[PDB]
Symmetry: D2
Subunit: 281 residues, 4 copies
Amino acid sequence: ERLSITPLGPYIGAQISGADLTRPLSDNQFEQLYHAVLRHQVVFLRDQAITPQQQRALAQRFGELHIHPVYPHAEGVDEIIVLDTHNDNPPDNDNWHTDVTFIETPPAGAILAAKELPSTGGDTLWTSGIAAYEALSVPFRQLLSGLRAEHDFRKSFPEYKYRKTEEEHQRWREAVAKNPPLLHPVVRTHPVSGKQALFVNEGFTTRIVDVSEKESEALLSFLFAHITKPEFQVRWRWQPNDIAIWDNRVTQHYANADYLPQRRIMHRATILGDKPFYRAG
Amino acid sequence: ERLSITPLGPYIGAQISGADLTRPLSDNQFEQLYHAVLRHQVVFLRDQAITPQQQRALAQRFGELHIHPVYPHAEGVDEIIVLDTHNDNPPDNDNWHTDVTFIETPPAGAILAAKELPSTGGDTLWTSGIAAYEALSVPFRQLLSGLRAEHDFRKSFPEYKYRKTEEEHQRWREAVAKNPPLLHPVVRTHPVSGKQALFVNEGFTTRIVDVSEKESEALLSFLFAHITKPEFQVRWRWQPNDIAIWDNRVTQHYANADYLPQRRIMHRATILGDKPFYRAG
Amino acid sequence: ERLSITPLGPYIGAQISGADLTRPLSDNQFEQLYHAVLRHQVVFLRDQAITPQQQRALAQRFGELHIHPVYPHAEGVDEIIVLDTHNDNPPDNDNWHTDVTFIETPPAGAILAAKELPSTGGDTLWTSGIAAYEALSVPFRQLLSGLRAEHDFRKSFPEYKYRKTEEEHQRWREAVAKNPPLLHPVVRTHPVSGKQALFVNEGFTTRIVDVSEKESEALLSFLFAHITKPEFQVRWRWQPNDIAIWDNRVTQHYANADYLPQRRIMHRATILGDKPFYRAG
Amino acid sequence: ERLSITPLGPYIGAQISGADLTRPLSDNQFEQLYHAVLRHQVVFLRDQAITPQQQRALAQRFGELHIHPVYPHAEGVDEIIVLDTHNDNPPDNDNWHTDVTFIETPPAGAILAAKELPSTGGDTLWTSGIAAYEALSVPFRQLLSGLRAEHDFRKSFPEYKYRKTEEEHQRWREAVAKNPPLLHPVVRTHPVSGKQALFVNEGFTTRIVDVSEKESEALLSFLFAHITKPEFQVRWRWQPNDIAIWDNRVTQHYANADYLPQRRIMHRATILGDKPFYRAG
């Protein structure tokens, strides 16, 4: 069966129907779905009442999945993380970020399923690093290509938010010790498509190390604004049993925090990635 | 008939059905539509195949309408402006702005009808000055309340873009002479609801005159970024015969320029406004 | 003897003669010196061939002395910092800072003596927090008055600069434990003159806690630039045996790093102040 | 006679004695003065009781002189600007600028003489475009080299400052007509030494035309701040009959406005340069 794929804009986003994600997909179907994620960077399917087991199986056709000990997981399925936000667990994703870029091999992508939603709010936005790179002037494309930038766990999890108790402070210290800052290319080459994408994000990028500190502040301030250009984005208003699949190698996203005290439950499968690299054009 | 009103988020935006905009509305219907625009700041109705005459009549129930000599208007209807963009007439609304704030009485609102659309692209976004004001810390709310800022035609229409011919340059000079910069409150009190809203926009606001030049640059740089927070916004993907009605007193908007060389035709009715003022809380 | 006092500008700085600082001063001379420091914020005395022992003795007349947790001290004189810079110890004070604001009672004064100088370069600049406050617009004065900001030893002494050896990393660890981050007023009231002064500095101030994170970044970016205005400053070109004495309650300073591979040796004494406070007025 | 030349820093500034500038200099002395200006970028000579006529004569030895379109000149000496400031003519040069970069052949040099000074205040600072360029990272040097920027007379002489009378508004109108905006290289190659220097200045540079508007704002904001680094500068405290001679190809300067209501009178001569160019290297 041919999938129905409707682009949501010229640069990023598509809505897909004609694929039952609870049951196994044919190879032709999955090839279409795969290439649609590659091309449109994030795709959305609706009315997909998927179990954590079916979501794991779907995600595993893209690649192997992250398992966390720190987060709660679905009953009987370790690869599906339960993101259950409310007053006692406020959301922390209302900032432009690429997931876990402070490790050497950030996730290649994710599958996110909406399980329980507030009456309104909680939109999620994606922005295209490819479109943003292509919109830079030639001098800026030549400048940023080949530079390296530092990504640091502590930019999104700063020490001053973990002082409340001595145990909490020490747990933060241990996480920092396990996750020292490291470098990634400022312009990342997609390992399948070969497209060039900006690969800095306000969530974790602290410094472009191949320019001076003041030069870095100027460039990152510009770039963190540049990626907020509406032309580079798609915005999704969730309904229950929506599924979002996105490529974390060449996008950032932002999850609105505008629904507390209401409750919101998402199920996530994180697809493991490889080391980001830059291959000159 | 009671209107069906679906909010699109907790702070701004709603989709409305149950009102035929081609034919006259009952008073009860219009009271609902009016209060929904007031509350949700921008509202969207779909499948409204409205003629310019019917759009004028609808808009005139909100207030009297702007007539321009400079723009093309619909056949036989001067109050409906035809916005026909393409290669020879590129779009210029891809910047965060409040319409015509460089005059003493900026429009109170607008009704926009989608007539011909590109295959994809051309989304329009709105951001809430009310939500943005309420999200400032107390020191910033106290700081900005009562200040005045200069709005200048030339910020969106700078001289260097009008040098191509001597006639074009002189036409710009004449427009500038008719439209000198003037002041508006930084925090505007809505004249009906009494809500306080940020009332600066990157399109036209050049300087907060009650602080120093460097202080102004710092504050406006922060504020122009602050209003781009996704929680303050709604984003609309157009279909033909969509109608958008919005309150220009307490919002900004941004029209994506991501569809050239394709053609896009909108019909607009501009509702005249009064002088912005600030009334302390 | 009456002191000879020549102002170097309208807001900050004076050159003084008529006092031999290498030998005991009369109570009358000392009162004159003390009030000149308060009035001119930084004063300079030339041709003063002082020993570290004599420099400590003079500093003791102003109050109780501070022992720095990281910097090396002079042989047998624990209270005198030796700033001995060269290829093997590159300069560390080419940033705008107020000395030791990371403690509860930041130094009220300091005394600096030029011991060995390069053939050229190494100028030191002072900027007046009083002049900087008075140059703020009234709305900005009202904004900052009453706000508090965090000061952190580690901002100017980051861990990665102290990992060359176990000795220096352990000394760093002990300094951090004794000097946790703390708050000081953003506008400080001088305890003698009653004048208001800006009291943040880029060396140690990390964030303003009474506003949002993005608001804090905007305000500190402005303030760190504001104090670099030339009208707020005096610039000193050193000769051997110069002495500078300054009011560290209401100034910042900056030491040029433009002389390597040449060697430069200064001696500093550091006089504890009271707890900084703000008293509205 | 051999000139006595004392450098004031490693990068910029020297004090000179052994030359009477009020009387004719030997070709040998002149060569020494000329090469000192090139080597030290700005030089200072004290106790030089020069007349405007003598100052013009000395300036003529360097090249053809410029007559300023707006500033008043000395009686009977059209080439000597009188900068006579006080309550009725407040100072106008407390901004970082390179003199008269709004013409095709900006002055290569200038000569400033202190005629009447306030009791204190009014220091003038110079900053080196050569030092500032060398402090850029290689990627930033490569970025800016070859770019062009627009310079506009009106940035420092805006119309609203010249509407007090019809005479001054008409003089402004004629200056604008004779001095339209034009481009200069962002990195300028010194025509004698071959050194590269930054060649933008906040006084007249409006935008970098080879990048986007937002990219231009980011780069100019960085560059206008970069040149204020103290290591790039020399600061001069005037005495009557001082003379400053500087290489206006590769420096900027800034005149403190901190002495009103006291009166200050300086005389300037301004020597035309060649067309600024960039030669890669």
